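re: that complex we talked abt at group meeting.

here r the seqs, copy pasted straight from the sheet so there may be weird spacing, ignore it
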Amino acid sequence: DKKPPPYKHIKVNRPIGRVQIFTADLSEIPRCNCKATDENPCGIDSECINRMLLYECHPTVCPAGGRCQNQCFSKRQYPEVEIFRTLQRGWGLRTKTDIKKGEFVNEYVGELIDEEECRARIRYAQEHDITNFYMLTLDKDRIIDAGPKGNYARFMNHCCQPNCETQKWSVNGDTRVGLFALSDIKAGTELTFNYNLECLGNGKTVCKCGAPNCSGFLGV
Amino acid sequence: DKKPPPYKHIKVNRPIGRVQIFTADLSEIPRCNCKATDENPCGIDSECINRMLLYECHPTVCPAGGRCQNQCFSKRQYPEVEIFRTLQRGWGLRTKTDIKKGEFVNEYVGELIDEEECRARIRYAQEHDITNFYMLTLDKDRIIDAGPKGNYARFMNHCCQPNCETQKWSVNGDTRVGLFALSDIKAGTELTFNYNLECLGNGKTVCKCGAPNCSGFLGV
Ligand SMILES: C[S@@+](CC[C@H](N)C(=O)[O-])C[C@H]1O[C@@H](n2cnc3c(N)ncnc32)[C@H](O)[C@@H]1O
Ligand SMILES: C[S@@+](CC[C@H](N)C(=O)[O-])C[C@H]1O[C@@H](n2cnc3c(N)ncnc32)[C@H](O)[C@@H]1O
Ligand SMILES: [Zn+2]
Ligand SMILES: [Zn+2]
Ligand SMILES: [Zn+2]
Ligand SMILES: [Zn+2]
Ligand SMILES: [Zn+2]
Ligand SMILES: [Zn+2]
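got the structure back, here u go
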């Protein structure tokens, strides 16, 4: 209870076994029409077509060059966060800097596994009386398991009225799960999101989010 | 058992209650670089950027005009299919025409509902000893229920080695689930797909797909 159980802090998703990882030729990556002279080229308020489709601008082709603000996953531009111990929800994540509405908070990084491996790892965890799951569905047949290996995003708890959301983006021709702010978040505030249908294994865990509209479940 | 239980055969997804339905300005829709003179403009073999991102070309802007082959959802270009009675998997869908690998087969159409309404409808169905579910997750918080209202796609069974797959496309700025052929399908063959993580409510139903690699479950 002094420190969270050991995990491998990794920078990017790690395929495991028979999980495939797509990658894109420039042919397959869209090109925006921002200009280097725009106020915040490819920025959150811009009309960047790439941004609007949840695509990163690729740096070798973005007409805004080095000023492009649409590479938040690639450059890993995470606001400063600290792991803290909550009351009833185990370990939590909070921000040490102010975050503006819509700003990129983090990527949910971990091991990529299939239905069979995810089932296996859930069975093992139950038999050992484990209630902490880090499984988040990437697409129809791949699951992020931030349990063994992950980054700071793995400590973000569920809340039924959250202050961040997940968004599925395309980066170098593959899906990445991003956390983005639903509103302005003041420094020291806990970063949560609604698990909705995306997280697995939580089953009958009783929600302790403390939100007025709390369903008593972690999404489902 | 003479005919499948009654449903409302609808053409497009119907939001229910508090489910929101996004729509796009042309600002928010990507533009391809095909030419009207290309062999199959925006066709399955083309380098259409819209096609590669699973976006329809919008007809008012596609540089290929009326020759654009990337409007399969909007125009509803479904090969001819017939409902037939299977041995152990209830009602099934089969094609009456040859289908080529990668060709658009159908859209999975139905009522759009949230986690709460989907849970409710599953509880009711169990209490009435119902084993047929038509629930397929659209995105993180919306579910297609092709049960009450749907189209021919609702009769496609699960198979662990299927001949079609789902693809999530964007049409007029919202997600649509499409069925596409994994290989050439000869006329009279049953159209199936692997439910993977996408279908809900099936739980412990034993798979009767008849595939050599059959897991004995409908995806999970
Ligand atoms: C992604 S982990 C979050 C970090 C976790 N608290 C820890 O100690 O590492 C998700 C797990 O934390 C717990 N948890 C997260 N949000 C919760 C909530 N709102 N209410 C209760 N438990 C929650 C559940 O056990 C869940 O499986
Ligand atoms: C989308 S409906 C398919 C049409 C359904 N057979 C009918 O009679 O309307 C899915 C349901 O059909 C059954 N089903 C589909 N694929 C199956 C399979 N491979 N094995 C067993 N039952 C299956 C299950 O009861 C499932 O809930
Ligand atoms: Zn841009
Ligand atoms: Zn850019
Ligand atoms: Zn709650
Ligand atoms: Zn095109
Ligand atoms: Zn086109
Ligand atoms: Zn099977």
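couple things i noticed - Chain B has one domain: 1-220. Residues 1-220 of chain B form one domain.
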